[PDB]
Amino acid sequence: NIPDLAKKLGSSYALGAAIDQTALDPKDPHSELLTKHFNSITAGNFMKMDAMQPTEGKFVWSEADKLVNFAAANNMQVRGHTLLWHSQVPDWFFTDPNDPSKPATREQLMQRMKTHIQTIVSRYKGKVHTWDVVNEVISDGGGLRNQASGSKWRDIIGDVDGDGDDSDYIELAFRYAREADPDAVLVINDYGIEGSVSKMNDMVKLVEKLLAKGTPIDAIGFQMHVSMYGPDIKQIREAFNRAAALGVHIQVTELDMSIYSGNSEQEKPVTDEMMLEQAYRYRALFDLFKEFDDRGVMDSVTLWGLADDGTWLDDFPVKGRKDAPLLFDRKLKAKPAYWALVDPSTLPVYRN
């Protein structure tokens, strides 16, 4: 009987949550949490490349089919995460179909990319409105990812057109997607770009170059894996403005707020003081999101989980370290951060 979160924000942008299949089950209390508070859904893992095509030519439709049925039934949008990545992708993509000990060919990988993207996008035309077409293609160390930075796509496919630039595989992923669905919102998704000037420099250069080629990119997705320690609102606002200045929209795709700064701090108990501070920080973030929503350039904001009982941050970057990153706690109770969003007066903005 608490306020419905998405409704209270009164945003142009959709408010989403990442889920597993259990939130599609009516006998599960996570499902009613999703439909009460959110109007958009992303699959955390079940729409990744390895989940959708575990072996070549054998697509798995059951999970995404159930997702789209649930979403239509409950008047919710769906983001498709993700069509291309360098993690959670089957090994068969990058090896020669007849010699598993040798790499796939430019032509073979291009064709595989096209088949994966188009079979999936075509099936879900008009049911999945938005796709993370590529995920995390920029290295944290500078430039586009290659083998040294965990990805095999660019080394195999390379400079297809021979123009001296090798962003071809990314351009192709977008072109293939648009070809399969003229109406879908096509997103390049990444982490770290909200707080790293050097990484955002690369994102800006990449998107500028792709847009100049007529690449159908609609939005830059900011994962927004932040902590209670940073980055500051000013840094984020700056990165958001750089994205919006390119004429594309922004999406916040994987928002969570770790209680730890990195991997050195050992597990710690959650205190009401910590939760209050998290509430101030979430309030500030949602105030920032409103700035861009008022410009009509924020498409969606998605929390990376419904509640603290299902956060990937319990195992990243430290296996077995309990975090508290989301709007609802481990017993599905609304947290101070939730209360700051629906009733900003619950958050005291003065003392004495």
Residue 142: burial class (beta carbons within 10 Å; 0-12, 13-18, 19+): exposed
Nearer to Ca ion, 160 or 270 (CB): 160
Tell me: does residue 168 bind Ca ion (CB under 5 A): yes
Stretch that binds Ca ion, among 62-70, 161-169, 201-209, 269-277 (CB under 5 A): 161-169
Stretch that binds Ca ion, among 56-64, 153-161, 226-234, 235-243 (CB under 5 A): 153-161
Total residues contacting Ca ion by CB under 5 A comes to: 5
- The candidate with the shortest Cα–Cα distance to 333, out of 21, 6, 22, 29, is 29
The separation between the first and the last C-alpha atoms of the chain, rounded to the nearest angstrom, is 33
Sole binder of Ca ion in the list 25, 28, 163, 232 (CB under 5 A): 163
Nearer to Ca ion, 172 or 324 (CB): 172
Whether 273 is catalytic is: no
Q: Which residues pair with 256 in a beta bridge?
A: 225
Q: Closest distance between Ca ion and the C-beta of residue 162, in Å?
A: 7
Tokens of 207: 């998107």
Catalytic residue among 132, 166, 171, 190: 190
Tell me: does residue 159 bind Ca ion (CB under 5 A): yes
Stretch that binds Ca ion, among 72-80, 155-163, 201-209, 236-244 (CB under 5 A): 155-163
Residue 58 has φ and ψ, to the nearest 5°, of -110, 90
> How many other C-beta atoms can be found within 10 angstroms of the C-beta atom of residue 198?
12
Nearer to Ca ion, 5 or 113 (CB): 113
- The candidate with the shortest Cα–Cα distance to 79, out of 11, 14, 140, 3, is 14
Nearer to Ca ion, 162 or 348 (CB): 162
Directed axis angle between helix 272-293 and helix 233-244, to 10°?
20
Tell me: does residue 161 bind Ca ion (CB under 5 A): yes
DSSP classification of residue 327: S
Stretch that binds Ca ion, among 41-49, 60-68, 107-115, 160-168 (CB under 5 A): 160-168
Q: Closest distance between Ca ion and the C-beta of residue 163, in Å?
A: 4
Tell me: does residue 158 bind Ca ion (CB under 5 A): no
Q: Which residues contact 153 (CB under 8 A, 6 or more apart)?
A: 84, 86, 109, 137, 145, 169
Q: Which residues pair with 189 in a beta bridge?
A: 135, 221
The percent helix, strand, coil of the chain (3-state, each to 5) is 40, 15, 45
Whether 136 is catalytic is: yes
Catalytic residue among 166, 254, 293, 323: 254
Q: Closest distance between Ca ion and the C-beta of residue 175, in Å?
A: 13
Tell me: does residue 165 bind Ca ion (CB under 5 A): yes
Tell me: does residue 63 bind Ca ion (CB under 5 A): no
Whether 254 is catalytic is: yes
> Which helix (H) or strand (E) is 34 found in, with range?
helix 29-37
CB 339 within 8 A of CB 283: no
Residues that bind Ca ion (CB under 5 A): 159, 161, 163, 165, 168
Q: Looking at the annotation, which residues are catalytic?
A: 136, 190, 254
